Paper text:
[name] is an icosahedrally symmetric plant virus in the Bromoviridae family that infects cowpea plants (Vigna unguiculata). The 180 identical capsid proteins are arranged in 12 pentamers and 20 hexamers. The asymmetric unit (highlighted) contains three subunits A, B, and C (magenta, green, and blue, respectively). CCMV is thought to achieve this by detecting a change in its chemical environment upon entering the host cell, which causes its capsid to swell, increasing in diameter by about 10%2.
Author numbering:
A (entry chain I), F (entry chain I): 42 to 187
B (entry chain C), E (entry chain C): 43 to 189
C (entry chain D), D (entry chain D): 41 to 188
């Protein structure tokens, strides 16, 4: 299905391939705004709902977990505070934060939040593809002259 | 058992699975059935797509398959698919009600690809990948020419 | 000059068959093969309606050229002696309409029993005659629903 | 004997094309060129309707002469094998009406795609055949107002 | 912006200006546009005539032009013209609403002439003499012949 | 004043400083889409009205003219076909093409149109600043997942 954005809101996405990691190692994955949103005016737009989900190779065995939280000094801790976790054990490998981050600016979103990934077994580059939604108000612009 | 839309009809065809080694993903090409291979018909628009497997009773281990836009690496196809057809589930099938709406049979045959994964080795015919496609009810010429 | 509307519930399928090389006055038999799109067994049991044959000739095709569709005859020449209508080059319209002679048979029967017979007074080189064939028949119906 | 009224909103444009010299049984291709008066780009996008071709022969033109308008074929002779109507000298009326085969294309498409094919059993000298062509098409419209 | 009469249509075409020396008048011939060059069309009757120039941004000095009955001396044409198209005015144009009513395109092409004057020298293309003509809406054959 | 865009339309701008030019020389000025519009989807948006106007140094003497037209093999010719010209002699040094380019895509706009500038006196870099508006439909985007 599709979950339509709120009136006056838009959606953005950007993904990041997982880095190599050993057994049960939790790794941190960075968040960077896309070039469309890196503009000054767009940076100030307020965020709405959010959604996180993973793309796993068909051979990905063991348990794999990921979530988005305010950056924790230790990577593993984030799960212990995340309001939801994307876990491969579930039928749908996703996790929605419908209101956790409502009200922050895209700048804040990219500044303090981060993606955390955990795998019981060892990982290799490209093993896990991290997908992310960011609902926010529509960027807007209009002008004239003389 | 699922009914088709008004103005649409379902075409069904099968493809065998090539021999492959353990844990290695393979690709299976989509070739249109004869009654759709005519130039008039392949221009038709697609609706919903249904994929469901048939396994030999001896099939063991894990087997997964999905149809997606052709990807450079076969394994990666499982990372953009809406629904996967997996043997560990009750019904070994998947549905793509929204993914491929609007595509043409030309594009369906040329762009998509059936990707199949097995934890263990496979031998030819070990899996029968059945594919079912909704599309506009094909139309036929209904008059003779003068002379 | 006219467009023979097909009967309600019927459609028209059209395909060609290039003539094989032949010598003067030699009658040749051309086999009728169903098009791929109809070749499915599901469709093979459909009931034929009106049948129409008409030729296309190279402008340099001299002499007399005749063709008709009949149940396969032991001798090729004999076919014309029973055909109710023959398409000829010399006539105004090079065609032959069989509104009733074959109604009721199955497309499988059409492929198995009937044959296209072609005769040229002068020698024919391949492609000199393009035997067009237009078969009206019940509209084939595709599967209505998925498989659970 | 008859005057085919053009459709409402359509007009008829008529022009000729003298035949080039040719040898016996040689099929020749004659290029279709729009008349100057229609040649404007503004008009080139007009949609064609019915098309009519008919020949004029010197009274001494013996043998058989055939001509038809078809999408350009790789081999000139083949054109007749697909033309739905052919103008022949031997028939009562040396003409060929295409009421539908070309409806919908643009005059630019008409100039680019179709070709006039001509065949004579005997040798032709220049001007022996005057291929008249009459193309019905939407009425061109001129500018309604000045430029300030 | 000016509307044409009922039963009339406007044909517009342009003519470039030939190189000429200072203060010397030149003549420019009127040639019918292709869509009017057919024998049927050139018999048509004319209505109002509009002349207006386009100057290169570098054009300096005085430039004048008018269309009149062909005169033996080019300069003299400015002495019988109703309105002149001059560059010193706001709009570099002229109008001949009554002068040429009733003339035929044959006569318009054969009798009139576009005369152009410049205080300074001109180089080819330095002026684009646009001409706009009202005339009876040309009519087309609307039926095929028997055979 | 300000001339509001049409319902569902937006506005964009981008300027270009004049190059050096000698007396009465007409120069050509290129048009390049901004990075916001260089994206594939935005490129297809249809244009509406347009406006051109200049910024002159206070010392700019003589006559200066500019206009936007389909590229002409010779630079000077463009004026002879422009539906309006921005000329310093007027009170407001501007020229509006309210409908000349309506219906083309931003790609077409950047491909075939070009800016032409003419100065009776010699010019130097920065002497003339060419300002341009491009009204067009709003770029739009919206998405979802699983």
């Amino acid at each position: 299905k599709a979950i339509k954005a709120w009136t006056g809101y838009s959606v953005s996405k950007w993904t990041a391939s997982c880095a190599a990691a050993e057994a049960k190692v939790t790794s941190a994955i960075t968040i960077s705004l896309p070039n469309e949103l890196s503009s000054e005016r767009n940076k100030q737009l307020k965020v709405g709902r959010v959604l996180l989900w993973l793309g796993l190779l068909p051979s990905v065995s063991g348990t794999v977990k990921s979530c988005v939280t305010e950056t924790q000094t230790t990577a593993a801790a984030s799960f212990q505070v995340a309001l939801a976790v994307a876990d491969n054990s579930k039928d749908v490998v996703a996790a929605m934060y419908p209101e956790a981050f409502k009200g922050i600016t895209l700048e804040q979103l990219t500044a303090d939040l981060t993606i955390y990934l955990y795998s019981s077994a060892a990982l290799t580059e490209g093993d896990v593809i991290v997908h992310l939604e960011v609902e926010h108000v529509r960027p807007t612009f209009d002008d004239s002259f003389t």
